[PDB]
Design a protein around this ligand. Structure first.
Ligand SMILES: *[C@@H](CS(C)(=O)=O)[C@H](Cc1ccc(CN)cc1)NC(=O)[C@H](CO)NC(=O)[C@H](CC(C)C)NC(=O)[C@H](Cc1ccccc1)N=[N+]=[N-]
Ligand SMILES: [Cl-]
Ligand SMILES: [Mg+2]
Ligand SMILES: [Mg+2]
Ligand SMILES: [Mg+2]
Ligand SMILES: [Mg+2]
Lengths: 250, 204, 196, 243, 226, 231, 241, 244
């Protein structure tokens, strides 16, 4: 009834490769395509709701998760690993930041904390790396809008736009042609839906696509009135109807 | 025996039109014995100013602690901390010693670099925030300072008027307290210039 | 506080006043001191309100977990869990609890747990500051195997006197009836019981 | 391959080979049985007399837990003792907190969870015993049998060890021929017969019969060993049936 | 401090004064004693101000994480249970006295919590040094099925009773209204019955009145660069 | 073969090879005999020397005034187990004012040995013990194996060539059990039993070690010229 | 090839121990089914008592976790009971800490997170079980949530688990394609149980006696299992129309 | 038990080498080249980014050059995530020293501390070493301008000019050829960029590929300024030196 795995399960091979990180990246490659695009007045993150059965209620499975009111996340790879990272990411935003400074962390620092958790699974005793790549989109007052990718190694890079998982190579080429520094949020959503259609085989609608934005402040979603400084969450998950409306103008 | 009144001293902060002022006396004592006439109680971390009254070992300790924390903040955030955020950091840090507190009366003063808004705040020894529009007082002559500030203060004073008001609030309060005085310093803070003035006062 | 539990033919009845005081100020005049740890196992609380609430919440947790594994616990089992908490933490608790419950096998049972953390199984029990004034009355008037209506009158008359003499007791008389039929709540107002 | 070298490793089948290897140690051991009767349970065991130097009636195999539960096991005897020691701690803490003596189904799961825990890690070995146990609680008589995997079920009759197939066949007849039930004194006699019949598998060495029982009428719901005249009456009944 | 809470037809309402004191001196003339926990759960605080503030912020933080985890609106009983278990743990050393109220899927709720960890259920409650002044008003005027307009009036009256008659309580009245099926409305400075009157004189000094020994410019910037 | 690297691994036929290898260390150890009557219990041990300059390794250890054992195998493991017995005997006396039952002492040794066979990192004990004692139910002899198996016996032997002594005792069973109130005759039967396990070497004065416990006899060890009487 | 013995990645990005735990799931050779009514959630499971010496009343793979939550397990019983005891403990602790009954979906998530830990941490093996949680949740209504050895979980309109899950799944899929609703439009739970049994009979192609089935029913504020005589009444009604 | 799966990260080979350290160094040899050059009036840090994509947001990106305090910076070669763990430790050691002594930490003391942490992972704990090599560029009032390097073994050494990462053999030959002791910062900037331009595996050296920094005692009134170059500023210095 002992944990005797106090030694690294990820080690350097003779060629200098960290095998378990490479294999975790292979697991991410098999995962469903997700993407992120940064506009001037917002960020969009999107993915396919690959339903394991038609009897399953795919609404209950959230691939796109709120981390803070102004930060959202999506993934490609192993869903369970993602779910626990979201739980830890939400908590670390409070313990290592909000309870100290009285405000939510900026995107880059929350990303840094998630990255740290993933790095530790790559060096600590008796654990495998996380088998996910995250795309984290967010906004804060002093950095503005931003989009980050986080890999199983713990490495993170800021992107203007990117894709991860199944059809990422084709999708990244598609985004390179379409992206410019003068995109509005609606233009980015339109490009996101076009890019995502290429990697999807079957049905393509609001029920089989999950899409969220980091945009304007939503005081209607706040739940209370009477504090001028709290203007509401910038994160908003688009509804099944809101996606279908934009698919008619596609 | 009462730690907050062994060493003595005072801090007062005031808001004006597009400016804040923070001021302190220079005395450090061992009860009746005056020891130092150069013990400044106002520190700064970038453009945020922190005055601290109370037990002098904790004044020094907390300065060193907030220098530490604001330096790391700056390296990670890639920007200087703002007064509103620093206020929350002071509160957090004091309350984490809830049942073995630092015997201090901190006062934050500064101008938010983005909004340009003047900001002052005061705390008790366990971190309860008092965010005031007008003024904050602290120290062994806090009652005297409350009396001076409450009558002398008026809103929207220009920097060079505010200097006169805060200086006269400090000087006259200090002269009615045995454990305050021995010199004084006044900082006048604007969005991108800060003037520091040493006041002539009675040395008893 | 005035509290009592009384066994009778069909089962058991718990009774209590509704006054909570901070010194001479009545902090709450409509307190519910009859509290549910299981479907048909209840308790009356006296002493520190913080302590008795903390205990009762832990007991409810233990009996809920007992029921998931081993089925419905006996009233004796509930009294034992109360005792274990009270006895082992006697230095840090001020709790005087009466435990009352209905089995179909055992019928009505009453257990009293005073300050020390001892257990005593009794036909009826009284406790709280106001109980001192009704030891004489309750001893003279209690009979075994009373009807429901007789037991309600016995409790109503008893707590009426406890309330009359004790300043710490007052408000409404709450009661909870535990039988095979189920769980019945009763309430009796000052204008009813004061004129008895 | 290599899936059988470490405990808690799933083979490609979905099997834990180390647990299946522990079963082989159980199958190698002496025969033990349990019989559920009208108001109680009877336990019996085969004790191989390795030598004349063994003191008769001294090397007692059946163990009591609390005052109302009997335990018997086949396989590695020390592993069985370790499990009963745990069972006694579980029964003690249950009684300490809840006052009432531990119910048999409740007790069964305590052993079950503990044995199952020894299939979760490579740092421990599975138990090399199948344990037959039971007794009388507030809801009546209960007989259980617990395997190295942690698996257990309730039984009308139970048998384990080298002579289990022989015993199981005999128990199945009793179930068919007595649907209304078996009395406690009948079950003692039948238990003796079944151990004697099951001894054909261990026929090289002679043996010593040991029986115990819990019964609501015959023992007041407490575990007791069958001794003296009642033991000899059962041995005589068993000796008559084989001839 | 005068804090109060009461229920009305399809909601619950909280009230509080705005004075913070140190012994006999007024530390803060405008402070918020109605703390935030969830969008539709609020907490009136009395006793030690730092403690009441810290405990609500902590439970509010944990309530937010719980809400995210379970994908549900937080319940008032969860805040209640978390607050009382924390306060009980510290044996009254966290000197916070709280009135918790809110709306959730179960309905509208009103509770009080004491520093040692005891809780009460009520249709109208009050805490702090002005509780007796407030409770006198609530006992005289509270009835069943109050309208929102009557409830705000009664709550603000209960707080006012404390403001005038209790030295501990003063300045302004804050209110928070939590109604079923609606956004909670937080009404800071709902009443302002204690504005300071205009002063007789202006004490603004002639410039150069104060004697100065030295002057200097403070370098607040990073690196003056070449 | 592949399943003997540690104690935590069963073989495919349900065997624990590390336990069986510990059992083998006992067979390499020097012979010791145990036997009893209704009044007394006797240990007889053939001690082994390294060479002619060396002393003869002690085989018998006292646990209490009414109990003790002889060892065969790793002597440091016997020291650990005997020390554990001493403590359990001592605990029984201090707390309950009660001499520890010999049957209960066996149960404690069994359980101590068992823990080392089920957990990783540890090894089985590499020693066999013969425990004799006189308690409230008379004379007792136990045989401890480091598998955990403890067995109450009239007589036995363990160590190299122990099968010769064990067969003799199996024949003599009806005679030596009746040797009541006569310690010298019971020792004689033990010395005659251990002689059946000798080859080439014979029982000399610093070779032989005898111990006895009984009705009005504390556990006492005889070495040197004290055992010359029985040669 | 030690990447197949512990929970670390193979070169393909696979966890073989997780995949082999899924195979252990079908070791019992028992098929389960869960469906939702208007006011209820019904779960049925095959009951096989091969030995005549077994006490059939003690042979069960349905567990009462809390008053509101029921759980059926597909897999070996020791792992099933490991999972059951933990879920009971978690449900009780939840109620104590947060002051309301643990929802079915939250428990499912909690057990799934525990399952995820066994796929990431080497010293713990996965449990070889699939856990199907059922309740009538006070917020979400009739609920079915299922957890597996990977740590995956999701809500269901209906579901099936076991060796012949695909046959049962397609049978249920075809019914809901006709009705075009997420549930069995039926008032009484008795008729929802009759539906569940009928559609298992059709899917598996086998008839059932009272002792061949095991039934669990979730209603508002309680989950309970049916006796053999309650099931017999159900089987009589099916045969009579 | 668990022993079966233990790689044994902290053992000697028969030749007296630490396997995992050697293999970590092999990992580092594939990372983007970083160069440090120390002059009389300042230090230059130049480094080549590895993942050329047009969609990478370069102005908010930091994979190579990190700030430890106001006086000390590092250039990274290896696993970025590993480096960030060590960087945050080094940032804390500097502030601990400042809190204790009320003086900025001397460069060598900070370097030794980090190097000691790396060493620990090679001698105890059974964990893999950090796959990181640092170039430390710093200033203090004892030794003035200092360059150091540390590697996964925990060994550190001081340099006038040095490279880490890819093509260090080629890079060190070129620096050894053109470096002189009386050199100045502007000359060192040019040397650093010319060296990367020749050793790079890419077709051409551009601004979007580089991270660049200087530490100068050429701030206003004898203070020390750390300059992390913005993308546009790297583009300007590339045109100035005549590479693009
Ligand atoms: C009224 C409570 S009362 C008189 O009925 O007990 C207010 C409630 C309140 C004020 C402010 C806030 C702000 N979020 C929330 C609730 N409480 C007070 O006025 C308390 C009374 O003790 N005041 C304080 O705690 C003050 C606050 C000022 C410093 C801003 N603190 C002190 O007086 C400290 C604290 C102290 C704390 C615990 C025990 C003893 C002393 N004393 N000093 N120094
Ligand atoms: Cl969890
Ligand atoms: Mg003075
Ligand atoms: Mg003086
Ligand atoms: Mg009264
Ligand atoms: Mg594992």
């Amino acid at each position: 009834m002992t944990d005797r795995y106090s030694f690294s399960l990820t080690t350097f091979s003779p060629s200098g490769k960290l095998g378990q990180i490479d294999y975790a990246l292979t697991a991410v490659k098999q995962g469903v395509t997700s993407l992120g695009i940064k506009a001037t007045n917002g960020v969009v993150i999107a993915t396919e709701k690959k339903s394991s059965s038609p009897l399953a209620m795919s609404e209950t499975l959230s691939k796109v998760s709120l981390l803070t009111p102004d930060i959202g996340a999506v993934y490609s790879g192993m869903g369970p690993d993602y779910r626990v990272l979201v739980d830890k990411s939400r908590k670390v935003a409070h313990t290592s930041y909000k309870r100290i400074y009285g405000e939510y962390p900026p995107t880059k620092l929350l990303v840094s904390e998630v990255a740290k958790i993933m790095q530790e699974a790559t060096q600590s005793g008796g654990v495998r790396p996380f088998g996910v790549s995250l795309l984290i989109a967010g906004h804060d007052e002093f950095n503005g809008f931003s989009l980050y990718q986080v890999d199983p190694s713990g490495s993170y890079f800021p992107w203007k736009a990117t894709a991860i998982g199944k059809g990422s190579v084709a999708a990244k080429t598609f985004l390179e042609k379409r992206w410019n520094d003068e995109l509005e949020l609606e233009d980015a959503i339109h490009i996101a839906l076009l890019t995502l259609k290429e990697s999807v085989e079957g049905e393509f609608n609001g029920d089989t696509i999950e899409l969220a934005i980091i945009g304007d402040e939503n005081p209607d979603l706040l739940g209370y009135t009477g504090i001028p400084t709290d203007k509401g969450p910038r994160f908003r998950k688009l509804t099944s109807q809101e996606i279908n409306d934009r698919l008619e103008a596609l | 025996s009462d730690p907050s009144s062994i060493n003595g001293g005072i801090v007062v902060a005031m808001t004006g039109k597009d400016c804040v002022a923070i001021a302190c006396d220079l005395r450090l004592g061992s009860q009746s014995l005056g020891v130092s006439n150069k013990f400044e109680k106002i520190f700064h971390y970038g453009h945020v100013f922190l005055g601290i009254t109370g037990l002098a070992t904790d004044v020094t300790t907390l300065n060193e602690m907030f220098r530490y924390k604001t330096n790391l903040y700056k390296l990670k955030e890639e920007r200087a901390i703002e007064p509103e955020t620093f206020t929350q950091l002071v509160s957090s840090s004091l309350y984490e010693r809830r049942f073995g507190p630092y015997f201090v009366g901190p006062v934050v003063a500064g101008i938010n670099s983005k909004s340009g808004k003047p900001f002052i705040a005061g705390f008790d020894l366990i971190g309860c925030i008092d965010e005031a529009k007008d003024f904050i007082v602290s120290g062994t002559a806090s009652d005297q300072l409350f009396g001076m500030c409450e009558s002398l203060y008026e809103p929207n004073l220009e920097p060079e008027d505010l200097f006169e008001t805060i200086s006269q609030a400090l000087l006259n309060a200090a002269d009615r307290d045995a454990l305050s005085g021995w010199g004084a310093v006044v900082y006048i803070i604007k969005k991108d210039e800060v003037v520091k003035r040493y006041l002539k006062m009675r040395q008893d | 506080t005035s509290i009592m539990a009384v066994t009778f033919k069909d089962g058991v009845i718990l009774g209590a006043d509704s006054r909570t005081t901070t010194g001479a100020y009545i902090a709450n005049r409509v307190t519910d001191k009859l509290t549910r740890v299981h479907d048909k196992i209840w308790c009356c609380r006296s002493g520190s309100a913080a302590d008795t609430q903390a205990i009762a919440d832990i007991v409810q947790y233990h009996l809920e977990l007992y029921t998931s594994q081993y089925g419905t616990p006996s009233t004796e089992t509930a009294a034992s869990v109360f005792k274990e908490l009270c006895y082992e933490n006697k230095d840090n608790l001020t709790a005087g609890i009466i435990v009352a419950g209905y089995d179909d096998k055992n019928k009505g049972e009453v257990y009293t747990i005073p300050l020390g953390g001892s257990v005593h199984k009794l036909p009826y029990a009284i406790a709280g500051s106001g109980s001192t004034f009704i030891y004489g009355y309750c001893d003279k008037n209690f009979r075994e195997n009373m009807s429901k209506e007789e037991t309600v009158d016995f409790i109503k008359h008893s707590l009426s006197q406890a309330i009359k003499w004790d300043g710490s007791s007052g408000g409404v008389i709450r009661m909870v009836v535990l039988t095979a039929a189920g769980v019945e709540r009763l309430i009796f107002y000052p204008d009813e019981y004061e004129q008895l | 391959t290599g899936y059988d070298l470490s405990n808690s490793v799933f083979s490609p089948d979905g099997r834990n080979f180390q647990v299946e290897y522990a079963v082989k140690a159980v199958e190698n051991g002496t025969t033990s049985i349990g019989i559920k009767c009208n108001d109680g349970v009877v336990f019996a065991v085969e004790k191989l007399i390795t030598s004349k130097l063994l003191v008769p009636q001294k090397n007692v195999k059946i163990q009591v837990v609390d005052r109302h539960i009997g335990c018997v096991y086949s396989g590695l005897i020390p592993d069985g003792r370790h499990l009963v020691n745990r069972g006694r701690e579980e029964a003690a803490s249950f009684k300490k907190l809840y006052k009432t003596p531990i119910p048999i189904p409740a007790f069964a799961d305590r052993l079950g969870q503990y044995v199952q825990a020894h299939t979760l890690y490579n740092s421990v070995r599975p138990f090399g015993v199948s344990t037959i146990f039971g007794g009388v609680d507030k809801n009546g008589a209960h007989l259980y049998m617990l395997e190295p995997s942690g698996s257990y079920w309730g039984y009308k009759g139970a048998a384990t060890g080298k002579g289990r197939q022989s015993a199981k066949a005999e128990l199945e007849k009793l179930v068919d021929h007595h649907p209304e039930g078996l009395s406690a004194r009948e079950a003692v006699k039948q238990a003796a017969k079944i151990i004697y019949l099951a001894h054909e598998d261990n026929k090289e060495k002679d043996f010593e019969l040991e029986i115990s029982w819990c019964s609501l009428s015959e023992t007041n719901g407490l575990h007791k060993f069958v001794k003296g005249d009642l033991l000899q009456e059962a041995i005589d009944f068993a000796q008559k049936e084989i001839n | 401090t005068t804090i109060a809470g009461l229920v009305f037809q399809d909601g619950v309402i909280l009230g509080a004064d705005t004075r913070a004191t140190n012994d006999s001196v007024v530390a803060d003339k405008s402070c918020e004693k109605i703390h935030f926990i969830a969008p539709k759960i609020y907490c009136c605080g009395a006793g030690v101000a730092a403690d009441a503030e810290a405990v609500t912020q902590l439970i509010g933080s944990n309530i937010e994480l719980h809400s995210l985890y379970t994908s549900r609106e937080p319940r008032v009983v969860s805040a209640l249970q978390m607050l009382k278990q924390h306060l009980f743990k510290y044996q009254g050393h966290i000197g916070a006295y709280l009135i918790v109220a809110g709306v959730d899927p179960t309905g509208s709720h009103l509770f009080s919590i004491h520093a040692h960890g005891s809780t009460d259920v009520g249709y109208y409650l009050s805490l702090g040094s002005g509780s007796l002044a407030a409770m006198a008003v609530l006992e005289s005027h509270w009835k069943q099925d109050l309208t929102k307009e009557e409830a705000i009036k009664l709550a603000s009256d209960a707080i006012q009773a404390g403001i005038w008659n209790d030295l501990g309580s003063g300045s302004n009245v804050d209110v928070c209204v939590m109604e079923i099926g609606k956004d909670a409305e937080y009404l800071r400075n709902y009443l302002t019955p204690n504005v300071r009157e205009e002063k007789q004189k202006s004490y603004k000094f002639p410039r150069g009145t104060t004697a100065v020994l030295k002057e200097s410019i403070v370098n607040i910037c990073d690196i003056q660069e070449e | 073969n592949n399943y003997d690297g540690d104690t935590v691994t069963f073989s495919p036929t349900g065997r624990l090879f590390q336990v069986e290898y510990a059992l083998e260390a006992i067979k390499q150890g020097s012979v010791t005999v145990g036997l009893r009557s209704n009044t007394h219990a006797v240990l007889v041990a053939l001690k082994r020397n390294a060479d002619e300059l060396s002393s003869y390794q002690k085989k018998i250890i006292k646990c209490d005034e009414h109990m003790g054992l002889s060892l065969a195998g790793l002597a440091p493991d016997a020291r650990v187990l005997s020390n554990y017995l001493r403590q359990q005997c001592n605990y029984s006396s201090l707390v309950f004012n009660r001499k520890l039952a010999v049957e209960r002492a066996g149960h404690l040794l069994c359980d101590k040995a068992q823990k080392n066979t089920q957990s990783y990192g540890g090894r089985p004990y590499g020693v066999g013990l013969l425990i004799i004692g006189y308690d409230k139910s008379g004379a007792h002899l136990l045989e401890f194996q480091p598998s955990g198996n403890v067995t109450e016996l009239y007589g036995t032997a363990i160590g190299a060539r122990s099968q010769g002594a064990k067969t003799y005792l199996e024949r003599t069973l009806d005679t030596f059990i009746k040797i009541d109130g006569n310690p010298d005759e019971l020792i004689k039967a033990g010395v005659e039993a251990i002689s059946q396990s000798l080859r080439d070497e014979s029982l000399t004065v610093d070779n032989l070690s005898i111990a006895i416990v009984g009705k009005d006899t504390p556990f006492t060890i005889y070495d040197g010229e004290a055992v010359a009487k029985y040669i | 090839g030690y990447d197949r013995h512990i929970t670390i990645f193979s070169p393909e990005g696979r966890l073989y121990q997780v995949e082999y735990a899924f195979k252990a799931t079908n070791q019992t050779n028992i098929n389960s089914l869960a469906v939702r009514g208007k006011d209820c959630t019904v779960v049925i499971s095959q009951k096989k008592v091969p030995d005549k010496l077994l006490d059939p009343t003690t042979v069960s793979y349905i567990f009462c976790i809390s008053r509101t939550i029921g759980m059926v397990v597909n897999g070996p019983i020791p792992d099933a009971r490991n999972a059951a005891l933990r879920a009971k403990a978690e449900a009780a602790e939840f109620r104590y800490k947060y002051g309301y009954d643990m929802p079915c979906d939250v428990l499912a998530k909690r057990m799934a997170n525990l399952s995820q830990i066994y796929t990431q941490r080497a010293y713990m093996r996965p449990l070889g079980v699939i856990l199907t949680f059922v309740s009538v949740d006070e917020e979400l209504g009739p609920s079915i949530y299922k957890t597996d050895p990977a740590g995956y979980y999701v809500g269901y309109k209906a579901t099936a688990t076991g060796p012949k899950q695909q046959e049962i799944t397609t049978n249920l899929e075809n019914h809901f394609k006709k009705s075009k609703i997420d549930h069995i439009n039926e008032e009484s739970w008795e008729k929802v149980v009759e539906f569940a049994i009928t559609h298992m009979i059709d899917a598996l192609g086998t008839e059932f006696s009272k002792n061949d089935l095991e039934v669990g029913v979730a209603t508002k504020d309680k989950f309970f299992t049916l006796s053999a005589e309650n099931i017999e009444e159900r089987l009589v009604a099916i045969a009579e129309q | 038990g668990s022993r079966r799966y233990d790689s044994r990260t902290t053992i000697f080979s028969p030749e007296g080498r630490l396997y995992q350290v050697e293999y970590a160094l092999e990992s580092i040899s594939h990372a983007g080249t970083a160069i440090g050059i120390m002059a009389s009036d300042g230090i230059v840090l130049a480094a080549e980014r590895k993942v050329t994509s047009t969609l990478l947001e370069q102005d908010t990106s930091t994979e190579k050059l990190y700030k430890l305090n106001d006086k000390i910076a590092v250039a990274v070669a290896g696993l970025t995530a590993d480096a960030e763990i060590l960087i945050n430790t080094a940032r804390i050691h500097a502030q601990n020293y400042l809190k204790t002594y009320n003086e900025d930490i001397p460069v060598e003391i900070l370097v030794r501390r980090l190097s000691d942490i790396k060493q620990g992972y090679t001698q105890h704990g059974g964990l893999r070493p950090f796959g990181v090599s640092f170039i430390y560029a710093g200033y203090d009032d004892r030794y003035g301008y200092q360059l150091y390097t540390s590697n996964p073994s925990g060994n550190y050494t001081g340099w006038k000019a040095i490279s880490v990462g890819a093509n260090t053999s080629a890079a060190q030959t070129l620096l050894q050829m053109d470096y002189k002791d009386d050199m100045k910062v502007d000359d060192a900037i040019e040397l650093a960029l010319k060296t990367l331009s020749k050793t790079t595996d890419s077709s051409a050296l551009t601004y979007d590929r580089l991270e660049f920094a200087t530490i100068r005692k050429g701030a206003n009134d004898g203070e020390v300024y750390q300059k992390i170059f913005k993308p546009q500023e790297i583009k300007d210095i590339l045109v100035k030196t005549g590479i693009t």
